[PDB]
Structures are given as C-alpha cells and as structure tokens.
C-alpha cells in the first residue's frame, strides 16, 4: 500500500554474475542494517564462473558493493590412503544467502566432490557446500554435510540407499531464532531430497581449514525412504521455519517438495526430529506446488500462518482451455492442536506465463494497521511481461483478495524482477518495514522504502 515506487534505490553487480539471485538483510553487532547479495555466476580467480557474495552498505543512492570474500580454490587432501577433492568451478556460490545475528551464510549448491582410492572413486557429484562468515571479525567456516568417502561400488551393492552424493546442500536455507542452520538438499537420497541441520556455533567451533571431511556431532539429517511417492520429489527445494504445534519450546520446519508423488507437489510441516505433523498436497500436477513457502501470521491471532506458491498453476478459462498463470495458497493455523484445513484463500495470477507465486515474502506490518502483510512475485507478469510484485494486506479473516499495490519492474525484459524477495526489516530507520527485490537477469537489486500512509 505505502511502498514508495517513485524514488527507488539500485545496487548493481558485475555483468553476467546474476547479482540479485538471492538476498537478505543483515544487521551487524551494532544493529546497522545492510544487504547481503548473492551472485552465483561471478568470475573466480581462474576467469571461471564460481559465484560470489556482496555486502552492500545502506545508501539511498545505491551503487556498487564490496565483496564478502571466500576461498574459491579447489582443495586436495591425501589421507587414509585416499584422495579427497573439491571442485568449485560453476558451484554457484551465492545461489542462496541468509543472515542470522552477525553471521552470513552463503551456499554453493553445485559444488562438486569426489574421492579417489587407487582405481576406484566415489564419483564426481554435486554435494554442495555452504560458506559461513562473521564479517566484522573476519572469521570463516564451512559446512558440507553430504560429503562422503564411500566408494562407488558400495552404493551399487547396497541399491543406492542413503546416497548423499547429489545433495546440492544449500539449494534452500533458513536459520532458526535460536541459531540452528537448516539446509535444503533436494537431490538427497538419490533425488528424494533431505534436510540437514546444525547449530551455527557448532559449525564454527568444529571447522578447521584443510580437513575437508569432519564431523559436526550436533548435526541431524533427515531420513531416506522406500516410498515411491517421494522419488524425484526434490524434498527441500524450499524451506522455512515457524511455530505450528503450540509448544513454544520447539521449532517446526516447513519443507517444499514440488515434484512429490509424480509431480503432484506437496508441502510438509515437521518437528525438529523430522517426524511429520502435516502434509499439504498440490492441487494440479506439474504446477510446482511447493516452489516457495513463507511463514507469517496474517490475521493477528498470534498463530503463524502458511502460504504456498505454485507458479505454474494452469487456471481454467473459457472453452475448456487452461492458462498458466500461477497461484498462491494461504493456510490459517487453527486454535490449539488441530490440522491445517483447506486453503482459506486462493490468489491466482493474471498474465500468461507470469509465474505468479514464484516468491512469497513476509513484509511484517507495512501499513501499521496491526496485521502482517505479504508480497507475491510474478517475475514475468505485467502487461509487458517485464515482471510485477503484488502486495496483499492482512486482515481479521486472513488476507485481502485484491492487491493494495502493484510494483512494476524498472528493468528491461528478461530481468526476472521478483525472482528473489525479502521484507519485514526497516533499513532506513523510519519506523516502516521495507522491501528489497532482486532482478538477477539485470544483475541488480531494487530497494523499496515504505512511507507513512497517504
């Protein structure tokens, strides 16, 4: 409603770097807000794509940003009569970034890994890896919970069970308020998908450079399955956290699985032991129900609500015709211990191929009316196909069915304006929470400042 679309702020990265693929707000130890931007195709030292991260100080004029530096060199260790190697070429560092306290977590989901033992090998596969930095102190750490040293022959003899070689850990990521990092790995267990969790403190204290294979004893991974409904389901394509079981001492996980059960799609709520509390089934096959999830209480009852994006949902139109426009589902949490029922509201896109619902960002209370609000992205929507971001305000019954404000892309065609979103933080300290929008196709980030209600 009250986001300023006239005076924007633009940050830019190098050409072809996909600067803006992911972003988040970052508060330093003194509470100063900055923007962490991922650029998963930034050129490394060898003039090869490896990815990179940028830490943008807040300036109303925007501009260039300094680099948050990470080790981009491939590593080799000969130990235990084996050879461990990491491959950072085209790893996509910055395909996801998230911030917690004064720590930044940036992940390279396509970092490859292999183990050599005489003539045998583990197979060069994308296990992924996340990089952790404390910018003010310069401290660095890594976390790669799917690296292994089992040889390829063993997986074949055991029918590829507990096969963590294709995790792509860091595909999606989130941190609990207590400091538990939770990673999505949709290629886990031969493309079923898994979750990997560990405290940020234990990641730092157990890491030493050059080890490549180490234990984080406090970590906890999800489990493999024999159920064909989960095969090729990409469980962990998107992840989020919230409070859904009434007990305020436990943190619940929300996991998107957009190809679950033969591309029907699903979203599941779990406790921190990965036991399942609820499952939301997709409405239409191949709609990618679960592509995006977000957790926020929109109707002001203190109970976290859930929205699910299905960006490829095909809406029924005249003459038995379907139109791919996208759809967002809202699930209000009922009182006490009960199951999330049918959707409370269905928001459906308008522009063909607009992919309405590709990203869903909680805004906090934008207009300061006591109810929390959201922003939904249609990166190829709008009358010109350049992309739109639509704001929906909360109310006592959930969300408004029509947008209070639409943000048209300020970038050229093909920028994917809205592919990444992040709100609910006051970056200019004016008392109203703001919105940063990534356009990786244009290698830029746009900042929308909220203003007093007109």
């Amino acid at each position, epitope marked *: 409603l009250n986001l300023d679309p006239v005076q924007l702020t633009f940050y830019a990265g190098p050409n072809g770097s996909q600067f803006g693929f992911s972003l988040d707000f970052h508060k330093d130890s003194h509470g100063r807000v900055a923007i962490v931007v991922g650029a998963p195709r930034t050129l490394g030292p060898s003039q090869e794509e490896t990815g990179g991260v940028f830490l943008c100080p807040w300036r109303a004029e925007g501009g260039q940003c300094p680099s948050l530096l990470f080790d981009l060199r491939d590593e080799t260790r000969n*130990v235990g009569s084996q050879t461990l190697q990491t491959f950072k070429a085209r790893q996509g560092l910055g395909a996801s970034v998230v911030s917690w306290s004064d720590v930044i977590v940036a992940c390279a989901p396509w970092q490859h890994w292999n183990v050599l033992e005489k003539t045998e090998e583990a197979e060069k596969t994308p296990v992924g890896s996340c990089f952790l930095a404390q910018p003010e102190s310069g401290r660095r750490a890594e976390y790669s919970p799917c690296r292994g*040293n089992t040889l390829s022959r*063993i997986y074949v003899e055991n029918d590829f069970s507990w096969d963590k070689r294709y995790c792509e850990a860091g595909f999606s990521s989130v941190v609990t308020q207590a400091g538990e990092l939770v990673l999505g790995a949709p290629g886990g267990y031969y493309f079923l998908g898994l979750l990997a969790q560990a405290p940020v403190a234990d990641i730092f204290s157990s890491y*030493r450079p050059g*080890i490549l294979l180490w234990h984080v004893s406090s970590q906890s991974l999800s489990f493999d399955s024999s159920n064909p409904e989960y095969f090729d389901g990409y469980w962990g394509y998107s992840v989020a956290v919230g409070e859904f079981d009434g007990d305020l001492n436990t943190t619940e996980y929300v996991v998107g699985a957009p190809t679950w059960s033969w591309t029907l799609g699903a979203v599941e709520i779990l406790d921190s032991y990965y036991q399942r509390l609820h499952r939301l089934r997709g409405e239409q096959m191949a709609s990618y129900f679960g592509h995006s999830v977000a957790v926020t209480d929109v109707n002001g009852d203190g109970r976290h609500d859930l929205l699910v994006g299905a960006p490829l949902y095909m809406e029924s139109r005249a003459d038995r015709k379907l139109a791919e426009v996208g759809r967002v589902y809202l699930f209000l949490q009922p009182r006490g211990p009960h199951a999330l029922g049918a959707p409370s509201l269905l928001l459906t896109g308008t522009q063909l191929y607009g992919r309405f619902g590709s990203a869903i960002a909680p805004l906090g209370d934008l207009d300061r009316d006591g109810y929390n609000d959201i922003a939904v992205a249609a990166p190829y929507g709008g009358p010109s196909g350049r992309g739109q971001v639509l704001v929906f305000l909360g109310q006592s019954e959930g969300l408004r069915s029509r947008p209070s404000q639409v943000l048209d892309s300020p970038f050229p065609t093909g920028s994917a304006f809205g592919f990444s979103l992040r709100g609910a933080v006051d970056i200019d300290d004016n008392g109203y929470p703001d919105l940063i929008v990534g356009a990786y196709g244009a290698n830029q980030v746009a900042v929308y400042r909220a203003q007093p209600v007109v």
Partner: antibody
Amino acid sequence: EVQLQQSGAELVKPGASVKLSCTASGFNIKDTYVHWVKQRPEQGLEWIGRIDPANGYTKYDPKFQGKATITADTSSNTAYLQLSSLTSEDTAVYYCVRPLYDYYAMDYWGQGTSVTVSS
Amino acid sequence: DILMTQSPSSMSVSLGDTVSITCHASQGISSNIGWLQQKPGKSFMGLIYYGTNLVDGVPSRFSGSGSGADYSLTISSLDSEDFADYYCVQYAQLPYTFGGGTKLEIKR
C-alpha cells in the same frame, strides 16, 4: 560427554578366544570410525583395524589378519574386538579409539582392556 | 608401511622449561599426524590432530608444527602433570603407524 567404557580385564588360555567390548556413552557409536589399538611395553603401539558401525565395513592391518575380528552392534551402542587362537604374544592392553572432528584422526580413547594369556 | 621415528627416546627436564619432541616419517605425510599423551598408569589423551590443531580441552602451552615428513610437539613452560609419555601417529596411509614414544622425566 564423549566417553568410551571398555569391558573388564580378561584372563584366558592359549588357543581359546576372547571378545572385548567398547560402549559409547553420550553419543551414537554410528557417528564415526571406531579403531582398535594394541599396546605392549617393548613393541609399543600397534594399530589393529577400524570399523564403520554405520555399515559394518572394516579395515585391518595385515599383521592381524586372522586373529582380529571387529564388529559393532548399533542397538547396544557397542563395538567389539574378537581375538582367536591366543598366544603369549597376544598379551597386551587393548584400546578403542575414535576421532573428534577429522574423519581420520585418533582423539578419544577408552580406558583400555587388559588381556593375559597363560596356561 | 610408514615408519615413525620419534626422538628422543626420553628427556630429563624441569618445570618451566620449553621442550620439543620430534617425529620423522619415512615419507611425506602432509600434516596427517596426531600427538598423544599417556599419563603414568593411565589411558591416552589426544593433544594435536592434523599437525597443528588442539583437541578440545587442551591447554595452549601445547602446540604442534612441521611439514612434509618432519614434525614437532612443543610444551612451553612445563607443568607438573606434563611429565608423562608422548606418541606421534600418522594417518596419511593405512595401516596407521605410531612412533616409538618419548618419556618426560624430572631433572635433578
């Protein structure tokens, strides 16, 4: 806390067989490799082998191929070292070892199990 | 196998001294070495792993260093509990092989 509580001291005859235990307290024995080491005052420290209790796979020093057999039961959170066709030279103290962080290290040690072969 | 030649066999020193054990390997082991402590009549305690990294709970007067095939454990300002046995161990190759040992004895 990570503690490795081994079985009590054994006393056996040559030609017989003994089976030692190493119980994980405060953690899951499935987490890391578990090694076995033999200590004599003259010969010093010798590495017997290792097991990955997650899958039962083992490695051995060829010096101990035949005498040493390493197993593990994740149910009782315990690893085992079985010794067969015992001899005077098999009189030593046996330790179970696991790493702290580095997958291949040797950082935590049990208290040690004393074995004595004699007729 | 890989031979771990640990020197000296023993040494007589006093409290507050800065002593240094060494360990030579028959080939390059690229810092894949650990250092151990065995107090008299007791079990073992890990000190160093991967050449220079202190095991959790070890005082900082202990320290490790070296490269290639030659490494050293140093105890700056000896304490009374530091008089015990010390072993190096390699894990660059299977089978793991230990050093001969080094006993720290009281000088008088």
